[PDB]
């Protein structure tokens, strides 16, 4: 079927050369010399695109466009006109024109416009697929040369870039090559963490910023500027690719000043990593210095009940002079309440908000059929996250902060990974106990938890952390475990997805 | 701050007129005569936009664009070139060029391109705001004059048009004016239905197409064309504005041929409206002719178990000779199974698929908190619907149908409305009730004490139906305050509103 063009111009007779040109290229052109007759044709037929002149004796192009868009708002409209006035450009852009071509127009300019507005999705698919075909071997060589935490950050950024570009391609071979590069990257990263993690605790060790350093190394310098009040947001369980998915939404309100990828401590779980952010201490030092607040895995109830108390203690230890408030948002109603009353906080130096909803979406993928239909794969997960963020009380809180001239600091405690591969053992990405059987190739084994700043019941206590996209399955119910936990979002172990996470500073626009 | 343009061309000397033109207009132009140096400038400085020539002795425009997009993918890239190289327009479009201007270029064509790529958001917001300021009074006058079901369809289309444009706007005053017009429209529509609905059942009545007419009046003509096999999709509970939210997604696969608004029967609920689609009979006639299949509200278990049987019987009654199959998808796994095995249906004349949306009314507090975070208001609801459609097995089924050359028919049984105002009932979270001893606020509901007159069943002559008007929800007196706090701002159906009742029927040809 030929592409059907409706061309409205009072001088459509003088445009015969253009018409013959497009008919040679397999376009069907229907001509009209006035807006009113063009509207009648547009109502009766299903054109693929309309060309409009601006200056016509009866209805103008923009008047014709208004009527046509009201009737069928999905059909692309191009203005083709002698008018060079900026006010007409702005009126046409503001009316959602697809393109605006100034006469005299090269017939190939029109052809470009037809291809760009009707065939761009297929052309982007074809071009992206061939770009990755020509790039993927270079990405395998770059992966092979990684030999520092900074190279790991750079390589992760490269994989995220290609993951987002390839998400809608059709070529399964190329899709599986990207999936094989992600598996190899996580396998190498797993080995890197296993070999370096304990050494990173040595005096004057060369190490990335981690959970227990985050507040002192990256938040306090922004506080000491005393330039604007700071809204410090921890979005629980946010992956780097989720941050990338709503980067352009945020930029409507906030201009990115600084981006520091940083490393979650082990295990990559709220009770350890998120408490470490707020305390500025490793879990073992939280147990030693704050026994009234620190809870081990075995103890009852909430594991992050005391973040305000950890934070106030850390602020005092650092000798800061600030007015500071902490909020934990656990549902829509709480978020909406804080958004509507945020102005109360205008005289704070620091407002800290923990927002738990993504964590809720991440285990809702397995448990609620609603979220399961909405988040079947990583593309669907980022899509649902973006829809969430754009319509969330959290973005209303951020817009309120913007109007009050707050600096925005946005971060997370850890990410999550879509687990594929069972690993037998006697949380599905770390386990702690005094008797444990495991596949040693699959896990990072820590026989002496105190050497990596974790608590131990006794000298027999071990930690086990899953690597790659492994999930720790009990032998007891192995087949049912595999069937239930396959393709779910888990955290606690080692992967780029769980461990390398954004720290972002923005100025209000 | 001036807009910062990076212009990469090996003959930036020949472009001086363009640069002076743009500098007069408050643009700051930084020139570079080769890709390598341009990349270094792009890394060090913060450009708003980049202009690239394709044909250069070193790195090409497209090679330069690849390096720059990798570093800062948000910055628009415009190609300004003359080339004789084959397929360069296609290669540049596929590389996500923002625009492609063929030399020699009118300097005003470049200026257009700058405004379109950097100012379009702000200009659409300003124009939408000013146009609605000029339009809203006209919409109030039109609402005042509505006096036919056809006028109601036209007014609804106008409100939908403006609702979609205004959703991303700053001006609270204009947002509240639109919200007040929607409230008034539903109030008047409620009175209109209350006055006219019973007359629509008279012999030879003037009435819109309804649930029980849909298959015979709108689907059979497409079947009798005997042109292509038909995929007939009923999306459960779909609003007009939800169809609008994914219209441009489905156009990648299917070209819209015909769009007919039609009217759900009362109640606007699956058990009545959706069974009527498949049976071609009103619920009362389903009870009379198919007592083995029809279930009343009082009976246990599924209310839509027999749609395949109702449809096969209707097809036989109409004397159609077709190979036809029915599928009801109630979860991800079912949808994925049908998408992955759709080619098995290649020899069918008709494939009917019921595709359930997400449950908007969970009895579990934790699940309702998730739905409210994702769909607190109409904009959030359309956003979630678009994310759903783009990532659903339903779109995979539609793409499979397209590759087999199926015609697509897309419709729904009824919409849903965001409920705001409690209305007490005595004697299910839907906007209708049926009972023999109902207490209700009569001002809030359309009351039908003779259900058989509107093709509904009655247990006995004490049986009544009540249908909520406006944005009312029917609240139980038992635990009233907790009920109100839970169901406030939820998407419900069963009653009278433009959202529940006036719904799309769409016919598409495969691309
Ligand atoms: Br029309
Ligand atoms: Br004129
Ligand atoms: Br005219
Ligand atoms: Br021309
Ligand atoms: Br590799
Ligand atoms: Br591994
Ligand atoms: Br550090
Ligand atoms: Br907690
Ligand atoms: Br301070
Ligand atoms: Br609050
Ligand atoms: Br809010
Ligand atoms: Br070069
Ligand atoms: Br890109
Ligand atoms: Br030129
Ligand atoms: Br007027
Ligand atoms: Br009004
Ligand atoms: Br009819
Ligand atoms: Br059912
Ligand atoms: Br037939
Ligand atoms: Br809530
Ligand atoms: Br009766
Ligand atoms: Br009654
Ligand atoms: Br009650
Ligand atoms: Ca003219
Ligand atoms: Ca967490
Ligand atoms: Ca050149
Ligand atoms: Ca080329
Ligand atoms: Ca329904
Ligand atoms: Ca009665």
Numbering used by the authors:
A (entry chain A): 2 to 427, 435 to 517
B (entry chain B): 2 to 428, 434 to 517
Sentences from the paper on this structure:
Among the different orthologues screened, we identified two distinctive conditions promoting the crystallization of the full-length PorX from F. johnsoniae (PorXFJ) in its nonphosphorylated apo-form. Heavy-atom derivative (bromide) soaking, followed by a multiwavelength anomalous diffraction data collection, were used to retrieve the missing phase information and solve the high-resolution structure of PorXFJ. Although the purified nonphosphorylated PorXFJ was found to be monomeric in solution by size exclusion chromatography, both crystal forms presented an identical dimeric assembly within their asymmetric units. The primitive orthorhombic crystal form gave rise to a single dimeric assembly (two monomers in the asymmetric unit), while the primitive monoclinic crystal form gave rise to two identical dimeric assemblies (four monomers in the asymmetric unit). In the primitive orthorhombic crystal form, residues 358–369 adopt a helical conformation in one monomer while presenting an extended coil conformation and an additional helical turn at the N terminal of helix α16 in the second monomer. Global comparison of the APS dimerization interface demonstrates that the 358–369 helical-extended coil conformation dyad gives rise to a total of 1,080 Å2 surface area, while the helical–helical conformations dyad interface is only 993 Å2, suggesting the helical-extended loop conformation to be more stable. In particular, only the helical conformation of residues 358–369 can support the proper coordination of the Zn1 by the conserved Asp360 and His364 residues, whereas in the extended coil conformation, these residues are facing away from the APS catalytic site.
Here, we report on the structural determination of PorX, a noncanonical RR that comprises a classic REC domain and an additional enzymatic effector domain that exhibits phosphodiesterase activity. Our crystal structures reveal that the PorXFJ adopts a two-domain dimeric fold with a classical RR receiver domain's fold and a unique alkaline phosphatase superfamily (APS) domain connected by a helical linker region. Each PorXFJ monomer adopts a two-lobed fold containing an N-terminal receiver (REC) domain (residues 1–120), followed by a three-helix bundle (THB) domain (residues 121–209) and a C-terminal APS domain (residues 210–517). All PorXFJ dimers adopt an intertwined assembly, where each monomer is symmetrically wrapped around the other monomer, forming an overall “X”-like shape.
